[PDB]
C-alpha cells in the first residue's frame, strides 16, 4: 500500500525499456508496462501521482538517437501515454519539479551540450523555454528545495564540473552557488532535510563513492559517509526520510546494487538488489 520507488529505462548492452516498482518495506520488485521506446540517460519525476519519463537517448544496434520525449505513466492503470515533446532532444537531462511543473535542464542533442532549460505545464500539455543556465551541463543532477532548483555538476562538453547553480523562478534567474568539493558528472542529486546531496559520479577518470551535501544556510558542501559501491549514472531518490541509490556503472560492471543512506547514523545499508544491473535510469517515488 505504501509509496514505491519506480525505475524506468537505463542501459545494459543497449538502452532499456524497463519500468519496475520497488517496495522498500520488503525489497520486492513489480515489473510494469515497458516504455514505448527504450532510453538511457533519461530522468523521472512525479506530478499529481503520475510518473513522467523525460529525455535520454536510445543507444541500440541501429543508432544513438537522442530523445525529446515526455511520457506519462499512470500507476492506477499501468499505462504509458505520450505527452508533448520538448523543444529539443536532451540526453543526460536533469529534471526537477516546482509547483506542479516539470523543468528539463541541460542535456545533449548530437554534438550540442545545452545550457537551455524548459518547463512543462501538465494542465496545458505545453513546454516553454525559460532562462538558460550560466553553464552548459549534461549529466547534471537536479534537486528542488523551497521552490529553488539546483543544477549540480555535469559535463560542458570539454570539462567535467564541480560547479553548481540555482534557479530562482520568481526572477527567471540563474545564480552560481558554492562549487562542490569534487568534480562529478553523472552523480545522483537529491534533497533531504534542507541539504542538497550529490552522491557518486565520475570525475573524468574515476567513478566515485564519495557523497557530499550542500547546506543552504551555511552555503558549504560537506562530505558524509561514502557509498558502499563507486558508481556513476546511478538513480537516486528519497523514500521515508532515507536516500536510495540504484544501479550505475562502477568502471568495471553494471551494478544491480541498491543502497539506503540513514542520515541519523550516517551509514549506508545494502538493501535488495535490482532485477538486473544497469545504468542511466530515471527514478521517482509515489
Amino acid at each position: 500500500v505504501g509509496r514505491l520507488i519506480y525505475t524506468a529505462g537505463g542501459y545494459f548492452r543497449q538502452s532499456l525499456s524497463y519500468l519496475e516498482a520497488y517496495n522498500p518495506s520488503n525489497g520486492s520488485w513489480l515489473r510494469l508496462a515497458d516504455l514505448q521506446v527504450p532510453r538511457s540517460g533519461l530522468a523521472g519525476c512525479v506530478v499529481g501521482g503520475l510518473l513522467y519519463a523525460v529525455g535520454g537517448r536510445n543507444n541500440s544496434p541501429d543508432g544513438n538517437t537522442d530523445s525529446s520525449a515526455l511520457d506519462c505513466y499512470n500507476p492506477m492503470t499501468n499505462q504509458w501515454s505520450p505527452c508533448a515533446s520538448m523543444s529539443v532532444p536532451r540526453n543526460r537531462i536533469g529534471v526537477g519539479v516546482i509547483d506542479g511543473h516539470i523543468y528539463a535542464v541541460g542535456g545533449s542533442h548530437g554534438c550540442i551540450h545545452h545550457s537551455s532549460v524548459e518547463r512543462y505545464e501538465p494542465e496545458r500539455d505545453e513546454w516553454h523555454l525559460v532562462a538558460p543556465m550560466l553553464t552548459r551541463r549534461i549529466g547534471v543532477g537536479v534537486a528542488v528545495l523551497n521552490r529553488l532548483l539546483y543544477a549540480v555538476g555535469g559535463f560542458d562538453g570539454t570539462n567535467r564540473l564541480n560547479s553548481a547553480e540555482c534557479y530562482y523562478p520568481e526572477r527567471n534567474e540563474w545564480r552560481m552557488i558554492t562549487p562542490m568539493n569534487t568534480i562529478r558528472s553523472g552523480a545522483g542529486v537529491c534533497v533531504l532535510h534542507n541539504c542538497i546531496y550529490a552522491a557518486g559520479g565520475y570525475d573524468g577518470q574515476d567513478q566515485l563513492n564519495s557523497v557530499e551535501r550542500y547546506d543552504v544556510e551555511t552555503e558549504t558542501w560537506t562530505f558524509v559517509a561514502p557509498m558502499r559501491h563507486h558508481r556513476s549514472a546511478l538513480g537516486i531518490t528519497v523514500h521515508q526520510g532515507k536516500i536510495y541509490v540504484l544501479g550505475g556503472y562502477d568502471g568495471h560492471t553494471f551494478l544491480d546494487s541498491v543502497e539506503c543512506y540513514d542520515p541519523d547514523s550516517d551509514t549506508w545499508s545494502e538493501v535488495t538488489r535490482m532485477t538486473s544491473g544497469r545504468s542511466g535510469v530515471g527514478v521517482a517515488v509515489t
Binding site: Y11, S40, N64, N91, R92, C111, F155, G157, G186, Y202
Partner: peptide, 24 residues
C-alpha cells in the same frame, strides 16, 4: 577529436562502449 568521440563522451559514465557509436 571526432564526432564519435563527442557522442561517446556523453555516455562514457554509463559504461557504454565507444564501439556502439561507430557505424562503418
Amino acid at each position: 577529436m571526432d564526432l564519435i568521440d563527442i557522442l561517446w563522451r556523453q555516455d562514457i559514465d554509463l559504461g557504454v562502449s565507444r564501439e556502439v557509436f561507430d557505424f562503418s
